[PDB]
């Protein structure tokens, strides 16, 4: 019922090799075509990827900026409110970005802001302006 271990003999494959006098070395030439063309395609993608690696040389170390570690604070300064309204206009509901810009307001505090001042800062009007982009 089972071929010996490490022998491969499928109903289908057997029919394929035996069909003609040459169809044995047909099937096995077409697996050297397939093999040489995959080993070729690897050689391109290796040179291609080697070029792209040389473009990234330097990393991004020149362009990194220090991190602002400021602690959350309950009090909204008018500075902070004004930054908020602008961050909203730019970022929509991405409360995470908005909190990063303002730099001393947690994501909860932001969502709160969205409700407290909703009427006074016309946050609906500001959000539909963001959507329009």
């Amino acid at each position: 019922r089972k071929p010996p271990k490490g022998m491969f003999l499928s109903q289908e494959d057997v029919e394929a090799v035996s069909a003609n006098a040459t169809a044995a070395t047909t099937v096995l030439r077409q697996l050297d075509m397939e093999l040489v063309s995959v080993k070729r395609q690897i050689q391109n993608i290796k040179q291609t990827n080697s070029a792209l690696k040389e473009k990234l040389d330097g990393g991004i170390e020149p362009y990194r900026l220090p991190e602002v570690i400021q602690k959350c604070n309950a009090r909204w300064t008018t500075e902070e409110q004004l930054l908020a309204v602008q961050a909203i206009r730019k970022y929509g509901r991405d409360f995470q970005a908005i909190s990063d810009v303002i730099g001393n307001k947690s994501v909860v505090q932001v969502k709160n802001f969205f409700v407290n001042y909703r009427r006074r800062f016309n946050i609906d009007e500001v959000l539909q302006e963001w959507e329009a982009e």
Binding site: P3, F8, L9, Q11, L56, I60, R64, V101
Partner: protein, 666 residues
């Protein structure tokens, strides 16, 4: 097994069942109740045992009955029917043994036996044993046929049969007790040596051998599991099945490389897309960092939109720097996943040239044993006799295997140098017309009741016929002769003045350069006390090498041997002999094989006797007149000495039943 069960096994019989032959001689018993069957079996096994415990003397019915205990010796008719069935069919009182009851004074019936090889000798010796009158006609100037044994001074070497293939169930075990054969086990250890002279490393030898065995089980799988027995109209040979199996292994080696490198590209393409993402990210990061610089120009204290711009660009930039660091962790994973894949590629080939040559030696070995190229063997049936293999190590006859025929011929009427040319068989009897081999116009004519033909199958196949049948053999017989395979296998005997090889090694191989010459001088035996090396030619080589002169053949051998043991170690041989069995007109080959398109059923067709038509018309159907024996007639033990022997015993029993009647069947 041991005891009375032992004796059954040792006589090729099931200890616990009645055989088909027993059923036909004892249908009263086998159709009857189970208990009488066990009695029958016990009596049979027990009598077999008595014979086997001492096959150097005749075993009489009186003696047998004397040594049965009750209840079994109560029924002395049964015991008599059994003892006689066994005697008749050569299960007991066969070979050379001291006769207790002297031979019937007046002989009954007359039989002519063609050929004094083992099948004929064994038959003759039984018919004579039964009081028939037997004469053997032999074309050669010696007995034994394909048991041929070279002798010169102290040199002794079989050019024919050489090996006793195990004593467990082998009738030659009995013969060995009766005749002085100096039997000697063959150490199965076989060093190979590649074309150059260099021992094959234990690493390879074991790897290729395992692969050989797997390839074989594979062929069996194709045959029995996938019904791969016929391709096109033609029947499939073991050889085709091996190419197919090999090609599929080669294929799978490729299929697995394709899939391995196909993983490398897919990963290499992931890394491509990742690097493009990473370059466009670096480029946006450069662009922002600029803009943050430009906006940080605008110095405090500044309006809130300009404050926003600075902070807004600063988060956006650190968001992309975060994202790029993520993408560059991924990059080092993909790059490690690819160092792994280039580290573990599957294997590069199925077999090197150096491997595929070692494999061809294994295939040569198989061609040697079947005495034919594997392209000729039936895939389906080449191994049909495997079920009957004997137990015990293989042995050689050391004083030379001729010792057996020659023994069997004691007391028989053998006409040597008598070549049968025509066999005539009619309702009233037979005439066999022979000539003197030496002086061929001198004619002889033998009249008899029956002819036992033991002509080798090669002879029976010869066109134009060497022996003519009158009337001609029927299509059913001639077609079987045509379908059956008759192979070929030669030996070169090298007689030296000194031993220069390993004496503890009975045999050793030589690997051929090419496939086409894989059977050529591929194996060497060291078996005799004298310093002799025997070298086989097998497969497609056996046939081709018959056209090449002895000196050239002996050359090619010494070459191979110098190449293995060094030019300063290998003398000239004192004596050489080179067999050519296909050329031999009394053999025309070595032994039969199950050719593709044939079956083991053809071996039975060969053994069926021939009944000629009636002389007077509307006269009752005669007796059969022409009987057949020889290695090609016994399907369970073809192509052997034991099988020939057995076929002879068979026919003797069958001829006796026919012309002396069978008292035991009532």
């Amino acid at each position: 097994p041991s005891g009375v069960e032992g004796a059954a096994f040792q006589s090729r019989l099931p200890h616990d069942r009645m055989t088909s032959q027993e059923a036909a001689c004892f249908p009263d018993i086998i159709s009857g109740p189970q208990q009488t069957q066990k009695v029958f079996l016990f009596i049979r096994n027990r009598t077999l045992q008595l014979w086997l415990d001492n096959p150097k003397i005749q075993l009489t019915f009186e003696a047998t009955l004397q040594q049965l205990e009750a209840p079994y010796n109560s029924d002395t008719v049964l015991v008599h029917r059994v003892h006689s069935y066994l005697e008749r069919h050569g299960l007991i009182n066969f070979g050379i043994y001291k006769r207790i009851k002297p031979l019937p004074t007046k002989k009954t019936g007359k039989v002519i036996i063609i050929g004094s090889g083992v099948s004929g000798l064994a038959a003759a010796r039984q018919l004579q044993s039964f009081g028939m009158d037997v004469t053997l006609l032999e074309a050669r100037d010696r007995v034994g046929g394909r048991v041929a044994t070279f002798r010169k001074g102290n040199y002794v070497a079989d050019l024919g049969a050489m090996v006793v293939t195990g004593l467990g169930g082998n009738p030659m075990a009995v013969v060995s007790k009766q005749v002085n054969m100096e039997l000697a086990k063959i150490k199965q250890k076989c060093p190979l040596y590649e074309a150059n002279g260099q021992a094959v490393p234990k690493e390879k030898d074991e790897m290729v051998e395992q692969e050989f065995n797997r390839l074989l089980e594979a062929t069996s799988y194709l045959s029995h599991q996938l019904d791969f027995n016929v391709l096109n109209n033609k029947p499939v040979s073991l050889g085709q099945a091996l190419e197919v199996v090999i090609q599929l292994q080669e294929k799978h080696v490729k299929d697995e490389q394709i899939e391995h490198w196909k993983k490398i590209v897919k990963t290499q393409e992931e890394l491509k897309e990742l690097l493009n993402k990473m370059v466009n990210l670096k480029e946006k990061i450069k662009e922002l960092h600029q803009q943050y610089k430009e906006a940080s120009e605008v110095k405090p204290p500044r309006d809130i939109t300009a404050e926003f711009l600075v902070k807004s660009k600063h988060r956006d930039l650190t968001a992309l720097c975060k994202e790029y660091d993520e993408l560059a962790e991924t990059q080092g994973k993909l790059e490690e996943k690819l160092q792994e894949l280039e580290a573990n590629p599957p294997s590069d080939v199925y077999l090197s040239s150096r491997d595929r040559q070692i494999l061809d030696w294994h295939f040569a070995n198989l061609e040697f044993a079947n005495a034919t190229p594997l392209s000729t063997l039936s895939l389906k049936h080449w191994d049909q006799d495997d079920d009957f293999e004997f137990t015990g190590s293989h042995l050689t006859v050391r004083n030379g295997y001729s010792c057996v025929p020659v023994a069997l011929a004691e007391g028989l009427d053998i006409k040597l140098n008598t070549a049968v040319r025509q066999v005539r068989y009619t309702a009233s009897g037979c005439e066999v017309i022979a000539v003197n081999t030496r002086s061929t116009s001198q004619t002889f004519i033998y009249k008899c009741d029956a002819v036992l033909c033991t002509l080798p199958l090669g002879v029976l196949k010869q066109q134009p016929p060497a022996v003519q049948f009158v009337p001609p053999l029927p299509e059913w017989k001639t077609s079987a002769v045509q379908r059956m395979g008759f192979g070929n296998l030669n030996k070169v005997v090298l007689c030296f003045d000194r031993v220069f090889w390993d004496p503890s090694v009975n045999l050793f191989g030589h690997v051929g350069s090419t496939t086409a010459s894989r059977g050529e001088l591929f194996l060497f035996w060291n078996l005799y006390k004298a310093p002799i090396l025997l070298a086989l030619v097998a497969g497609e080589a056996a046939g081709i090498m018959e056209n090449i002169s002895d000196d050239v053949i002996v050359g090619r051998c010494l070459a191979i041997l110098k190449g293995i043991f060094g030019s300063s170690a290998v003398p000239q041989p004192k004596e050489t002999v080179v067999s050519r069995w296909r050329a031999d007109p009394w053999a025309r080959g070595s032994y039969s094989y199950v050719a593709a398109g044939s079956s083991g059923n053809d071996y039975d067709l060969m053994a069926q006797p021939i009944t000629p038509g009636p002389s007077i018309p509307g006269a009752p159907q005669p007796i059969p007149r022409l009987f057949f024996a020889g290695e090609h007639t016994i399907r369970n033990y073809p192509a052997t000495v034991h099988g020939a022997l057995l076929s002879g015993l068979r026919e003797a029993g069958r001829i006796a039943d026919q012309f002396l009647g069978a008292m035991y069947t009532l």
